[PDB]
Structure formats: structure tokens, C-alpha cells
């Protein structure tokens, strides 16, 4: 053992609790998504590596039930992630956090991000020229927003929203509200 | 090796890398602040145990600069959080994330939370009679919102906002915007 690697673990934890809790930078948060994605098989492999050395019985019928639970829920959620990939053919359906997606037409193409709420009203704020909709920095936009965005969740929830009210604040900024006007089942 | 105490660690990591973002439940979000608060004077005293042993000075001298890194930001941040307390006599000035506060008058008293941005426009959404301003669930509210909310800083400035536009949606819900109209430096 050495009292240096533990220090680097304890230091990498503060940096994950501070900066990872933000979606306001694209190429900063997919890395955290990948880390959380990879943490799942490591735990199951560690747990199954304790039920084969079932000495003292504390490594026996305890490291078997939890192995079942953690190997069960992982499949139960991978199934849902693949089903979400089926409808919306996007590589965003494999994030280990949610199963709801938000689509925003911008600059010719469409920008897709994961969402956590699926509520009735969605707020949009343009600060200095950059758009920040739902805890997500979504690039560059003047007040030329879209009059219709969509939120998709596998098995129903093709919900179409609508620009209900927009306004301009001093010289660069503005706000807008999207009120859900249509629902679509699958 | 004891492969039963390691899976219990990765499971806790998967648990806290999943539910620690939401600031909605108060009695679930106050605990994360305490846990993150305790990690500084643990890392600080976990890097020092590599100067007690000091085996190889090419590997025992790294934890001198490293322990001089996190013994220096810790003071220069507690100092600032205490000043946030000094102006605003609140107990939210001691969370280890930000150094800006948000004040919302509600049901007679004031509801205070920590805020991270201090932008020019602030959004507010009422869903089913519950108010949600900046990632915090502030309680219960009809459309009886306030024409003035206040964002506070350590020494920076007091910044009063103003109800610029509100709209009722679906007999219970609503959207509102607070466009900054005033700024006051202490």
C-alpha cells in the first residue's frame, strides 16, 4: 500500500462532484457519461469475484443476491436504452442516465440532447447570443428561434411543443416559452 | 482478497453519480453538500501521510507540492464562503459549490438557495402549483408570483430583478421571466 494513490482517488472525487454536474460544455460531459457507463460491469465483475472464494460464508449467500440484483437491473435498463435507440436512430439513447430526448433544429441541422423531465412547459433563455434550454448549452442563436421543437421517449411521448411567447432583453439576450400543444402515441 | 468490500464501493459510486444532480428534494440535496464538504479535510490529511513515510523522495516529494495545492485553495474558498455569510446571515453560504445566493419571497417568509450563474435573465416555471426557478424546487405557488426577486453575492453586488412577463398555461401551470433591471454594489 501507498498513501499517494488513495490521495489521487480522493482528489479525483472532488473534481467529479464539482464540474461534472453541468451540461454547459459538449466535450466535457460525454467523458463523464462514458465513466458512469463503464462503472456498471466493473461492479458485477467484482461481486462475482467474491462468490467463488466463499470462505467464512460472508463471501457466500450475500455476494450472490447482490450479484443477481446488479446483473438484473443492468440488463433491464440496457433493453430500454436499445428500444430508445430503435425509434430515434441516435447515439444519445445509450447514455446511462435517462430515456428521454429533446430535439432542437439549429443552423440547418438538428441538435439532440438527453432530457429528464418531460413536463408541460419548457423555458428557453438566450444569453449574449448563446442558447441554454433545459440545462444544456446548445450553441449559437440570435432571436431567430424555432416555432416547434419535439421531445421523444420510447413508447409514446412524441410531444410537439410550440413557441408561445418570446421577448427581447437588452441588445443581445431574450427569453421564450414552449407550451406543449400536441401529443403523439406510437 | 476481500472482494465484498470493493463491490459495495462501486455500487455507492454508481448510486451517487446518478441521484446527486437534482436539487429538487431538499432533505436529499442537503446531504450531498455535507459529504462534499467533508472531502477537503480528508484529502488534505491523506496527502500528508506520504510525508510521514517519505520512502523515495522522487515519489515522496510529489505529495508535498500536492498537499500544498489542496491546503491553499481550501483556505481561499472558506474565506469567501464566510463573507457570503457575513453579508447574508444565512446557512446556505457554506455550501462548497458556489458563492452566490438567490432570494425568493414566499408565503410570508423568504426562501434562499445557492445559485451558480448570476446572468441577466432568470426563468421561472410553475408546474401544477409548484415553483421551480433555477434548478431548485421552491415549494408551493399559484400564479401569485412576486414582482421582485433578489440575487446576492459575497461582495460583488446586490442585483434586483423584475417580473417582466408571465403567462398562465393549462389552468394550473405558468411561465415567467425576471429581466434584471437594477444593480447595486455594496
Amino acid at each position, epitope marked *: 500500500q501507498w498513501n499517494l494513490v488513495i490521495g489521487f482517488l480522493f482528489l479525483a472525487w472532488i473534481m467529479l462532484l464539482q464540474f461534472a454536474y453541468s451540461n454547459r460544455n459538449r466535450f466535457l460531459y460525454i467523458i463523464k457519461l462514458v465513466f458512469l457507463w463503464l462503472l456498471w460491469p466493473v461492479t458485477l465483475a467484482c461481486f462475482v469475484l467474491a462468490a467463488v472464494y466463499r470462505i467464512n460464508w460472508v463471501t457466500g449467500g450475500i455476494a450472490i443476491a447482490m450479484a443477481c440484483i446488479v446483473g438484473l437491473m443492468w440488463l433491464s435498463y440496457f433493453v430500454a436504452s436499445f428500444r430508445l435507440f430503435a425509434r430515434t*436512430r441516435s447515439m444519445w439513447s445509450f447514455n446511462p442516465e435517462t430515456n428521454i430526448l429533446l430535439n432542437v*433544429p439549429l443552423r*440547418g441541422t*438538428i441538435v439532440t440532447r438527453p432530457l429528464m423531465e418531460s413536463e*408541460l412547459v419548457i423555458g428557453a433563455v438566450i444569453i449574449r447570443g448563446h442558447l441554454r434550454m433545459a440545462g444544456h448549452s446548445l450553441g449559437r442563436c440570435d432571436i431567430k428561434d*424555432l*416555432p*416547434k421543437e419535439i421531445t421523444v421517449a420510447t413508447s409514446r411521448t412524441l410531444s*410537439y411543443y*410550440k413557441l*408561445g*411567447a418570446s421577448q427581447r432583453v437588452g441588445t443581445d439576450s431574450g427569453f421564450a416559452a414552449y*407550451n*406543449r*400543444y*400536441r*401529443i*403523439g*402515441n406510437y | 482478497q476481500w472482494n465484498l468490500v470493493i463491490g459495495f464501493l462501486f455500487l455507492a459510486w454508481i448510486m451517487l453519480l446518478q441521484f446527486a444532480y437534482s436539487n429538487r428534494n431538499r432533505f436529499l440535496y442537503i446531504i450531498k453538500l455535507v459529504f462534499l464538504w467533508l472531502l477537503w479535510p480528508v484529502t488534505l490529511a491523506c496527502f500528508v501521510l506520504a510525508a510521514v513515510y517519505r520512502i523515495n523522495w522522487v515519489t515522496g516529494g510529489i505529495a508535498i507540492a500536492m498537499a500544498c495545492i489542496v491546503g491553499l485553495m481550501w483556505l481561499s474558498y472558506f474565506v469567501a464562503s464566510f463573507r457570503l455569510f457575513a453579508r447574508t446571515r444565512s446557512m446556505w453560504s457554506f455550501n462548497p459549490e458556489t458563492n452566490i445566493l438567490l432570494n425568493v419571497p414566499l408565503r410570508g417568509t423568504i426562501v434562499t438557495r445557492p445559485l451558480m450563474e448570476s446572468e441577466l435573465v432568470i426563468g421561472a416555471v410553475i408546474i*401544477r402549483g409548484h415553483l421551480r426557478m433555477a434548478g431548485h424546487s421552491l415549494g408551493r405557488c399559484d400564479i401569485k408570483d412576486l414582482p421582485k426577486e433578489i440575487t446576492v453575492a459575497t461582495s460583488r453586488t446586490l442585483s434586483y430583478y423584475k417580473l417582466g412577463a408571465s403567462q*398562465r*398555461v*393549462g*389552468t*394550473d401551470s405558468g411561465f415567467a421571466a425576471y429581466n434584471r433591471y437594477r444593480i447595486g454594489n455594496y
Partner: antibody
Amino acid sequence: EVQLQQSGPELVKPGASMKISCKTSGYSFTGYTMNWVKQSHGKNLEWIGLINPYNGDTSYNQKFKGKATLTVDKSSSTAYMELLSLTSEDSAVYYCEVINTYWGQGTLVTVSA
Amino acid sequence: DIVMTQSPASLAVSLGQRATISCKASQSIDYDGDNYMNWYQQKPGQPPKLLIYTTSNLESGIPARFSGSGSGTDFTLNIHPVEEGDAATYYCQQNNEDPYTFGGGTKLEIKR
């Protein structure tokens, strides 16, 4: 600002097929959904179908299925409805809409010998 | 295949008086506690235009004289200060289910 120009009226015999072409302008062609309406003889609004110009993913009701094909040309910013096996009950004023706010001017389809 | 009906076939309303149109639905909608209903207006020779969405949300550009309300399976459109230009046919739409349906349409006539 936003325009949905129609191709104009046309007359065909029973059993014929045709293509209603709608040309849009004022905005980026993809990103907004397309809806079609029939408004048969009289004053009765109806829903035919809904399509996404960006990737397809069409949706119909159970009454107009097999009677129309909805497609898109991204190169001309155009949307098409193919009317199949037209009969005497198909003569109507068909037109496109986007988000229940903007409508085309109406294409008059007459089915008669 | 959700059916919606409007009670009056037509209205004869003098200037300055209130006009009312009612509609009933076979389904309660009740999606997350929110009802859905769209009110449309059409004039001769023109395509329709949207007036009210989600049972109470006034469309931008529509005067406040048009007030929509209701709940459950009962929906009502109120036009209080009826003027001489309010001569058109008004429609309802569910905007809730994949087989989207429209109402029959009620014609508004003005007395003189």
C-alpha cells in the same frame, strides 16, 4: 414570412393518380413537421397524415391508409402527396399545414370524366 | 375515432351581445390532469386559422374577446363583445390522440 405555395387545380378521371406539390419558403426546410388536410365537399375539416421532412417516420390514420403516399424532396424544399385510385368522393380542396398556424392556399382536385 | 359534437348549429347574435358555442367529447382526455382542445375559425374562400389551443391558451394575434374554457368533457367558447366582423365558421379539434378528429362546425350570423 413563411410561405406554402400550391401547384394549382387539376381535373382527372376516376381511377387516376396525381401528385400535389407544395413549395415552402421563409425558413429552413427541415425541422418542422408537415400535416395534410382534405376539407371535402361542404365545410368539414379532417386529418390525413403527418410526416417529418428530415428522416421520414410517417404516421397515418386507419381510414386514409393505402389511399395516399406522403413524401419529401429536400433539394427543392418541396413536399408531395400522391393520390391513388381517385373516386368521386375524393374531389376536394387539399392543402398543407405546419404547426396549426400556417396553411397553403389550397389545391382543388376534381375527379370527373 | 373519438367523436365530438357542438350543441348549436348556428347563432344569431346582435352587435355588442355575447355569443357562446359549446362542445362535448366522448373522452375525458385527462392527460396528466390537462385537457386538450383547439378552436378554429374559417371564412369563405380561405383556409382556416387557429384561435385557441389547449382549451385556454389564446393564440398570438387573436383579440381577447375570444375566451375559451371548460374541463373534463365540457368545453366552451365565449365571444363577449361581438362585432360586425365576427362572421365565420368555428371548429373544434382534440389534438390528443393519433386519430385526430374535428367537430362539425357552427356558423355565426349577426343581426341587424
